[PDB]
Amino acid sequence: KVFGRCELAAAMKRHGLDNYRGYSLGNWVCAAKFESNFNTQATNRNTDGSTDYGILQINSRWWCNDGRTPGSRNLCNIPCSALLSSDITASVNCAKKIVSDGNGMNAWVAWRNRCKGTDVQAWIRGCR
Numbered sequence: 001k002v003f004g005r006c007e008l009a010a011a012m013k014r015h016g017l018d019n020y021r022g023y024s025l026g027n028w029v030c031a032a033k034f035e036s037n038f039n040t041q042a043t044n045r046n047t048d049g050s051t052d053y054g055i056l057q058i059n060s061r062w063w064c065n066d067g068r069t070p071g072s073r074n075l076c077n078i079p080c081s082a083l084l085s086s087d088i089t090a091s092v093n094c095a096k097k098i099v100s101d102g103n104g105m106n107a108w109v110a111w112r113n114r115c116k117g118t119d120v121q122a123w124i125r126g127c128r
């Protein structure tokens with residue numbers, strides 16, 4: 001699924017992501033735009049042999065199982081394939097663990113370089 005801006009904000013907000021660990025709802029919609037282009041099916045291969053999956057590009061090294069990342073952890077206890085669903089539940093519960101882990105939203109390289117220190121509220125502007 002390719003999400004609209006307002007449509008993804010309302011879904012993230014219903015899954016409780018809004019002000020989670022003090023990160024406003026604009027920081028999250030920001031990250032998804034630059035990580036996936038709002039596309040739940042996005043995949044990207046990393047040079048170490050791990051792969052990032054879904055709208056927040058969650059990495060197979062620590063967070064889920066794709067059966068081809070040797071001696072890696074599955075700390076979300078999910079197949080990576082589940083992070084590719086039109087239903088963003090899996091991706092959101094899995095991001096709640098990552099953003100809590102000590103480094104906050106810096107785990108997302110596109111958030112650090114394109115959203116951190118910007119007017120993030122602009123990303124939910126106009127939505128009901």
Ligand SMILES: C[C@@H](O)CN1CCN(CC(=O)O)CCN(CC(=O)O)CCN(CC(=O)O)CC1
Nearest residue numbers: 002003004005006007033034037038123125126
């Ligand atoms: C809502 C309209 O903006 C729709 N829009 C009309 C064309 N716009 C004109 C403009 O943005 O005033 C210029 C192109 N636009 C550049 C950008 O927005 O950064 C990329 C395409 N956009 C992507 C999006 O906006 O989500 C969809 C088409």
Ligand SMILES: C[C@@H](O)CN1CCN(CC(=O)O)CCN(CC(=O)O)CCN(CC(=O)O)CC1
Nearest residue numbers: 004005029030033119120121122123124125126
């Ligand atoms: C021509 C405009 O499209 C210029 N635009 C600024 C105004 N936009 C317009 C809008 O989308 O209605 C609203 C804010 N915008 C939200 C979003 O677009 O996703 C984030 C910033 N954008 C990023 C981008 O466009 O890729 C910068 C360029």
Ligand SMILES: [Cl-]
Nearest residue numbers: 024025026121
């Ligand atoms: Cl915001």
Ligand SMILES: [Cl-]
Nearest residue numbers: 067068069070
């Ligand atoms: Cl594996």
Ligand SMILES: [Cl-]
Nearest residue numbers: 021103104105
């Ligand atoms: Cl933090």
Ligand SMILES: [Gd]
Nearest residue numbers: 005033122123
């Ligand atoms: Gd924009």
Ligand code: NA
Nearest residue numbers: 060064072073
């Ligand atoms: Na793994």
